[PDB]
Each structure stands twice: as structure tokens, then as C-alpha cells.
Write an enzyme that holds these catalytic residues in place. Structure first.
Site, PDB file in Angstrom:
ATOM      1  N   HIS B  42       0.806  -1.238   0.000  1.00  0.00           N
ATOM      2  CA  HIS B  42       0.000   0.000   0.000  1.00  0.00           C
ATOM      3  C   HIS B  42       0.839   1.288   0.000  1.00  0.00           C
ATOM      4  CE1 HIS B  42       0.269   0.181   4.515  1.00  0.00           C
ATOM      5  NE2 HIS B  42       0.227   1.475   4.261  1.00  0.00           N
ATOM      6  N   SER B 185       4.271   2.436   8.456  1.00  0.00           N
ATOM      7  CA  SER B 185       3.809   1.426   7.481  1.00  0.00           C
ATOM      8  C   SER B 185       4.929   0.958   6.562  1.00  0.00           C
ATOM      9  CB  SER B 185       2.707   2.017   6.568  1.00  0.00           C
ATOM     10  OG  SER B 185       1.487   2.150   7.282  1.00  0.00           O
ATOM     11  N   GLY B 186       4.991  -0.343   6.282  1.00  0.00           N
ATOM     12  CA  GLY B 186       5.994  -0.912   5.405  1.00  0.00           C
ATOM     13  C   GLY B 186       7.269  -1.253   6.156  1.00  0.00           C
TER      14      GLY B 186
HETATM   15  C1  LIG Z   1      -8.433   0.756   9.060  1.00  0.00           C
HETATM   16  C2  LIG Z   1      -7.264   1.115   8.126  1.00  0.00           C
HETATM   17  C3  LIG Z   1      -7.679   1.081   6.636  1.00  0.00           C
HETATM   18  O1  LIG Z   1      -8.093   2.120   6.123  1.00  0.00           O
HETATM   19  N1  LIG Z   1      -7.561  -0.089   5.925  1.00  0.00           N
HETATM   20  C4  LIG Z   1      -7.202  -1.411   6.485  1.00  0.00           C
HETATM   21  C5  LIG Z   1      -8.076  -2.531   5.927  1.00  0.00           C
HETATM   22  O2  LIG Z   1      -8.120  -2.403   4.520  1.00  0.00           O
HETATM   23  C6  LIG Z   1      -8.685  -1.193   4.054  1.00  0.00           C
HETATM   24  C7  LIG Z   1      -7.775  -0.047   4.466  1.00  0.00           C
HETATM   25  N2  LIG Z   1      -6.724   2.433   8.479  1.00  0.00           N
HETATM   26  C8  LIG Z   1      -7.545   3.645   8.568  1.00  0.00           C
HETATM   27  C9  LIG Z   1      -6.638   4.706   9.186  1.00  0.00           C
HETATM   28  C10 LIG Z   1      -5.325   3.990   9.491  1.00  0.00           C
HETATM   29  N3  LIG Z   1      -4.167   4.703   9.020  1.00  0.00           N
HETATM   30  S1  LIG Z   1      -2.809   4.833  10.068  1.00  0.00           S
HETATM   31  O3  LIG Z   1      -3.247   5.326  11.337  1.00  0.00           O
HETATM   32  O4  LIG Z   1      -1.906   5.616   9.279  1.00  0.00           O
HETATM   33  C11 LIG Z   1      -2.114   3.176  10.226  1.00  0.00           C
HETATM   34  C12 LIG Z   1      -1.208   3.208  11.448  1.00  0.00           C
HETATM   35  C13 LIG Z   1      -0.825   1.899  12.078  1.00  0.00           C
HETATM   36  C14 LIG Z   1      -1.041   1.558  13.348  1.00  0.00           C
HETATM   37  C15 LIG Z   1      -0.552   0.226  13.688  1.00  0.00           C
HETATM   38  C16 LIG Z   1      -0.006  -0.352  12.613  1.00  0.00           C
HETATM   39 CL1  LIG Z   1       0.681  -1.926  12.623  1.00  0.00          CL
HETATM   40  S2  LIG Z   1      -0.027   0.620  11.155  1.00  0.00           S
HETATM   41  C17 LIG Z   1      -5.435   2.646   8.789  1.00  0.00           C
HETATM   42  O5  LIG Z   1      -4.483   1.902   8.583  1.00  0.00           O
END
Ligand SMILES: C[C@@H](C(=O)N1CCOCC1)N1CC[C@H](NS(=O)(=O)CCc2ccc(Cl)s2)C1=O
Ligand SMILES: [Ca+2]
Ligand SMILES: [Mg+2]
Lengths: 52, 234
Positions: B42, B185-186
Site C-alpha cells: 500500500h 507502514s511498510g
Molecule cells: C483501518 C485502516 C484502513 O483504512 N484499511 C485497512 C483494511 O483495509 C482497508 C484499508 N486504516 C484507517 C486509518 C489507518 N491509518 S494509520 O493510522 O496511518 C495506520 C497506522 C498503524 C497503526 C498500527 C499499525 Cl501496525 S499501522 C489505517 O491503517
């Protein structure tokens, strides 16, 4: 707890069970020592080791 | 990274940082070998053109070990899906090889069966990155690391509003304010075994960062060991 389930079969890294005995092996860049258990880096900066 | 500690000298040498045109990090990666970086599929959509920086612990000073590398080939898993983040994995082949040194070394790839039975059954793994130090914050200028417990698979699925596929695993804390966050991420999830660190996951997603009753979701690298091997042979 037997073979690989018993303290990783005494292997430094990978442990497999073959013909009811432990077989150790190592990650790329390591060579299995003469004792068939320890893993020896083949050259500098082997994988998975913190640098000093 | 929310909580955790700074990576001290030589402690996270397999950390890579994907940097955009503006020299800003947006994702992490893991050094697998002199030519290959492991990252999340991603992440490939978060910048038109990017490079890979290794050997950096402080984005505000020149430590002397930093090296920027251009990417020659991007190998993104063909089954990746943006709707669920299933198959969230990519390998990058670099144009020039990484010269290992202090703060620059690869993490080990484990074998599947042994990793699942021995590494993933350990109490904890370690996640690292230059991501936010709080859900609403700025990216960290310091590389950080955090010990994260492996979380019971049933508990994780119960906790999640989004599907947890066979290609994912959970790690982190129920309520403790410690987790990976945006910008991580990654990046690497590694597990230590007898002082050798093996790659066990890729920072993938989470419902926010360090939220109560929510965990960090990581790509299950053991499900992709043959795929990684193939991608690194061409
Ligand atoms: C729920 C998920 C999401 O939109 N997805 C996951 C399921 O497939 C559709 C897209 N999502 C929404 C907001 C969030 N973005 S983020 O806060 O940048 C991440 C941060 C992380 C926390 C722990 C890990 Cl491991 S990394 C995130 O990853
Ligand atoms: Ca620096
Ligand atoms: Mg939580």
C-alpha cells in the site's frame, strides 16, 4: 516436549525433525558449525545481527 | 511509533525509509539483502517517485552512515487489494547495492514452519520506524523501536472492525499507549531468537494508533517466504 519442541533441539537457528531426530540449519550467510548446531557467519555484517 | 524507545547506535540496522521527492519519509522498509528492500504494497501509492534511505537514525543531522538508493524495480504482490489490505507486501530491487556498515545490515528471513512454531510463539516482536509518536502528531525525527506482544488471533479478530485475513497477524496492546503509527507502514516487525533478529512482519494497518481495544495489524511474512524468495531471484 521432544526434539525441536525441547529448547529448539539445541539449534542456534532453524530446527527440523527428520526420521525422529533433530536437524539444525541456518539462515543464508551462515554455515552450520561442526557440532551440527551452531550457526557461524560466513562474512561481515551477517543478517540479523545488531552492528556493535 | 507511539511509546517505545529511540533506536540506539547499531540497534535497528535493517530499517529502511522510503523518501519522497521532498526528502520526507512516508513509509518504512526492511533491508533483506544488498539489493532488496521489503515494504508494504500500500506504500507504493503514497508517492509518484521515491528513493530508499538506509543508515539513518536522526533525520536532522548527518550521522555519517546514511545512504540514499534509487529503485530499479518494484515487485508488488499481484493479489494486493486496497479494500482490505490483503497481500500487503512488495519487494524493491535497488539500482546500486547497499554497502553494509554500522547501522546498515539486513534482517534474516526465517523458514516458514520454524518461524510459525518458534518465532511467532515468542512473547514479543519489535517494530521500528520514523512514524508519528502520537495519532495526531508529526513524524518522528528519530528512529524508534517498540517491543510488541503477539496477540491471540481470536482476540484480534474480535477486536477488529475490518477483516483479518490469513495474511495478517496482530501485535501490540489492548490499552497501553504503545503502537506503530502513520509513517511506520511498510517498516520492520522482527523477532529476536538467540540474539539474531528475523523478519516476521511488515507494519500494515491499524484503526488509529494505540487506541483502546485495538491492535496493530501486520503482514504475515511467513505466508510469503516463497514469494519473497522468487521476487529476489529476478
Ligand atoms: C483501518 C485502516 C484502513 O483504512 N484499511 C485497512 C483494511 O483495509 C482497508 C484499508 N486504516 C484507517 C486509518 C489507518 N491509518 S494509520 O493510522 O496511518 C495506520 C497506522 C498503524 C497503526 C498500527 C499499525 Cl501496525 S499501522 C489505517 O491503517
Ligand atoms: Ca541523519
Ligand atoms: Mg490498543
Amino acid at each position: 516436549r521432544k526434539l525441536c519442541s525441547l529448547d529448539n533441539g539445541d539449534c542456534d537457528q532453524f530446527c527440523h525433525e527428520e526420521q525422529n531426530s533433530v536437524v539444525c540449519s541456518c539462515a543464508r550467510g551462515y554455515t552450520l558449525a561442526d557440532n551440527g548446531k551452531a550457526c557461524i557467519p560466513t562474512g561481515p555484517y551477517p543478517c540479523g545481527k545488531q552492528t556493535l | 511509533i507511539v511509546g517505545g524507545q529511540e533506536c540506539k547506535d547499531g540497534e535497528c540496522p535493517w530499517q529502511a525509509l522510503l523518501i519522497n521527492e521532498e526528502n520526507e519519509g512516508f513509509c518504512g522498509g526492511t533491508i533483506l539483502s544488498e539489493f532488496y528492500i521489503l515494504t508494504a504494497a500500500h506504500c507504493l501509492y503514497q508517492a509518484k517517485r521515491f528513493k530508499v534511505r538506509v543508515g539513518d537514525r536522526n533525520t536532522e543531522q548527518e550521522e555519517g552512515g546514511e545512504a540514499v538508493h534509487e529503485v530499479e524495480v518494484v515487485i508488488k504482490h499481484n493479489r494486493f487489494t486496497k479494500e482490505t489490505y490483503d497481500f500487503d507486501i512488495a519487494v524493491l530491487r535497488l539500482k546500486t547495492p547497499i554497502t553494509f556498515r554500522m547501522n546498515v545490515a539486513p534482517a534474516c528471513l526465517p523458514e516458514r514452519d520454524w518461524a510459525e512454531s518458534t518465532l511467532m510463539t515468542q512473547k514479543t516482536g519489535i517494530v521500528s520506524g520514523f512514524g508519528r509518536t502520537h495519532e495526531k502528531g508529526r513524524q518522528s525525527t528519530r528512529l524508534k523501536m517498540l517491543e510488541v506482544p503477539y496477540v491471540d488471533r481470536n482476540s484480534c479478530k474480535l477486536s477488529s472492525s475490518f477483516i483479518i485475513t490469513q495474511n495478517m497477524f496482530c501485535a501490540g496492546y489492548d490499552t497501553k499507549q504503545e503502537d506503530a503509527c502513520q509513517g511506520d507502514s511498510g517498516g520492520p516487525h522482527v523477532t529476536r531468537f538467540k540474539d539474531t533478529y528475523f523478519v516476521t512482519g511488515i507494519v500494515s494497518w491499524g484503526e488509529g494508533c494505540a487506541r483502546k481495544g485495538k491492535y496493530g495489524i501486520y503482514t504475515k511474512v511467513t505466508a510469503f517466504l516463497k514469494w519473497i524468495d522468487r521476487s529476489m531471484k529476478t
